[PDB]
Amino acid sequence: QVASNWEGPPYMTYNQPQAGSVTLPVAGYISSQLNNYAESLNDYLASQAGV
Amino acid sequence: MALINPQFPYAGPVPIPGPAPTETMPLLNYRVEGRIAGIQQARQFMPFLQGPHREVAEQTYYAIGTGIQMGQTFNQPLINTQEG
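Structure tokens for the assembled complex are given below, as produced in the milestone run.
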């Protein structure tokens, strides 16, 4: 039982920045990445749902 | 291992007065039957304990739990718009 997107309990880790993380980027930036934007939303929702 | 004097030898022992011959003979002392007396108790209220002791004391532990873990309001970083 391991999950590739599990960052911990989702009510405790949803607004938590990561370890190094001086400045965070945005998850998507037609004008920029599009299928990387859609997979950055699917990976976040898989973290909040646990596989 | 004495040396015999040839000029003044002597003979063996002659009879002398004696110590009343029955008075050097003892009686054979006649033991009666005996008994370790009383009814013995089975156990004794001892002044010391009969078990082992410990030289040093060791610290014991018991597990405890923490509590319901809550969420937090983090201070959130700024956006990396090429200044960072």
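Chain A touches chain B at residues 9, 11-12, 15-17, 21-26 (CB under 8 Å). The two ends of chain A are 10 Å apart (CA to CA). Further analysis is deferred to the final report.
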